[PDB]
Amino acid sequence: YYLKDAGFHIRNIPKAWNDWNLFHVFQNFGKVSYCRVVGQSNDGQVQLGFVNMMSVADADEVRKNLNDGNLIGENFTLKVTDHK
Amino acid sequence: AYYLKDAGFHIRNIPKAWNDWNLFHVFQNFGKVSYCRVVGQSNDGQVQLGFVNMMSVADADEVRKNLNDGNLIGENFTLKVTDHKNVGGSLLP
Amino acid sequence: SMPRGADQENMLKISGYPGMLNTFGIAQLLTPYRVNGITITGAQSAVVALENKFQVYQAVQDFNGKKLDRNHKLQVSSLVV
Amino acid sequence: GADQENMLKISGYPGMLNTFGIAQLLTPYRVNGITITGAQSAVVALENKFQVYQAVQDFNGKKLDRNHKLQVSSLVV
């Protein structure tokens, strides 16, 4: 189905992004297996997504760059939580 | 039969008591081995003839590095090593 | 061979590898990306279906222009231009 | 011609793998056929017994990640 410990739920995605924007963020941490923006809030202001890295080692690289489950980028903050 | 270009060797002067695993062990020290066979013997039986294909040209180059005048020298053997060449036009693209 | 109905965004062209490779060997060239189907198109070329367009994108970046050895250079491109 | 001395058993990899993914585990050894025998197990025909020997040494007991370690053994003892 999936690879244990390689996947993330993504919240607080900016409204303008598409799946390639989400991909570009996570490609800097390792290889990406799967990346989807799945929908958006009722107000249309934030989006929810899912990213699977290619390997647990790639996902651990993501984890090393979080702070309290937040991925703080140049102009955004993503809430990143493990998929189980 | 076609083998990875520049990855293979013809081997002469193999000691009479060796089998293909002895030959494999000698070449494994230089890298991964794709194929290994003792194909015949001399007339006096004192030595045997063989063929070794390394898994990659890089492995075969590491063999070519440890040679001395076309010979692989061991603590009690000396192998005559020459490059294998495929037959032209046999590959069908 | 190839799954009936595959989407072109999942496909890439790969060429230049050694002419004796079989389909499993072509898949090995593309480690670690998920390969779902391979159609050989010549001794040294094939069309490959990967899991999705992100894996195609990364495989092109990883493998196009790759020197396999002094006799073989890979050409990798997405089928969607 | 098939030959059991060309063959190995491999298990313990992620259950999501297909046969191409199992072959990817065995890079760079030449894989000529794969039979799935379970959700995390297969039998693989490599080119010859020397590749079997080297694959067993390279991959038996190999940690793939904290959740998976490979089991690799020649079919003939």
Curated annotation (Swiss-Prot), chain B:
Organs and tissues of expression: Expression is restricted to the germline (at protein level).
Subcellular location: Cytoplasm; Cytoplasm, Perinuclear region; Nucleus
Disruption phenotype: Worms whose mothers are lacking mel-47 exhibit prolonged interphase between the two and four cell stages of development. Mutants arrest as early embryos ranging from 50 to 80 cells with no signs of morphogenesis. Chromatin bridges which connect nuclei remain present after cytokinesis appears complete. RNAi-mediated knockdown results in maternal effect lethal (Mel phenotype). RNAi-mediated knockdown results in chromosome segregation and cell division defects in early embryos. RNAi-mediated knockdown results in defective activity of the PIWI-interacting RNA (piRNA) silencing pathway.
Positions of the RRM domain: 7-86
Quaternary organization: Component of the pid-1 variant of the PETISCO complex (also called the pid-3, erh-2, tofu-6, and ife-3 small RNA complex) containing at least pid-1, tofu-6, ife-3, pid-3, and erh-2, which is required for the biogenesis of 21 nucleotide PIWI-interacting RNAs (piRNAs) that possess a uracil residue at the 5'-end (also called 21U-RNAs). Within the pid-1 variant of the PETISCO complex interacts with pid-1.
Function, in words: Component of the pid-1 and tost-1 variants of the PETISCO complexes, which have roles in the biogenesis of a class of 21 nucleotide PIWI-interacting RNAs (piRNAs) that possess a uracil residue at the 5'-end (also called 21U-RNAs) and embryogenesis, respectively. Promotes the biogenesis of 21U-RNAs. Mediates the interaction between the PETISCO complex and the PUCH complex, the endoribonuclease complex processing the 5'-end of precursor piRNAs, thereby enhancing mature piRNA production. Required for chromosome segregation and cell division in early embryos. May have a role in DNA replication.
Name of the protein in question: Embryonic developmental protein tofu-6
Source organism (scientific name): Caenorhabditis elegans
Gene symbol of the encoding locus: tofu-6
Curated annotation (Swiss-Prot), chain C:
Knocked-out gene: effects: RNAi-mediated knockdown results in chromosome segregation and cell division defects in early embryos. RNAi-mediated knockdown results in defective activity of the PIWI-interacting RNA (piRNA) silencing pathway. RNAi-mediated knockdown disrupts the localization of tofu-6 and erh-2 to the perinuclear region of the germline. Instead erh-2 accumulates in the nucleus. RNAi-mediated knockdown results in decreased expression of tost-1 in the germline and in embryos.
Gene Ontology cellular component list: cytoplasm; nucleus; perinuclear region of cytoplasm; RNA cap binding complex
Tissue: Expressed in the germline (at protein level).
Coiled coil: none
Keyword list, A-Z: Cell cycle, Cell division, Chromosome partition, Cytoplasm, Nucleus, RNA-mediated gene silencing
Paired cysteines (S-S): none
Keyword set includes Cytoplasm: yes
UniProt-listed GO biological process terms: 21U-RNA metabolic process; cell division; chromosome segregation; embryo development ending in birth or egg hatching; piRNA processing; positive regulation of cell division; positive regulation of chromosome segregation
Subcellular location, record wording: Cytoplasm; Cytoplasm, Perinuclear region; Nucleus
Subunit and interaction comment: Component of the pid-1 variant of the PETISCO complex (also called the pid-3, erh-2, tofu-6, and ife-3 small RNA complex) containing at least pid-1, tofu-6, ife-3, pid-3, and erh-2, which is required for the biogenesis of a class of 21 nucleotide PIWI-interacting RNAs (piRNAs) that possess a uracil residue at the 5'-end (also called 21U-RNAs). Within the complex interacts with pid-1; the interaction is direct.
Primary role: Component of the pid-1 and tost-1 variants of the PETISCO complexes, which have roles in the biogenesis of a class of 21 nucleotide PIWI-interacting RNAs (piRNAs) that possess a uracil residue at the 5'-end (also called 21U-RNAs) and embryogenesis, respectively. Within the pid-1 variant of the PETISCO complex may stabilize 21U-RNA precursor molecules. Promotes the biogenesis of 21U-RNAs. Required for chromosome segregation and cell division in early embryos.
Protein's name according to its UniProt entry: Protein pid-3
Protein species of origin: Caenorhabditis elegans
Classification of source organism: Eukaryota, Metazoa, Ecdysozoa, Nematoda, Chromadorea
Gene name, Swiss-Prot/TrEMBL: pid-3
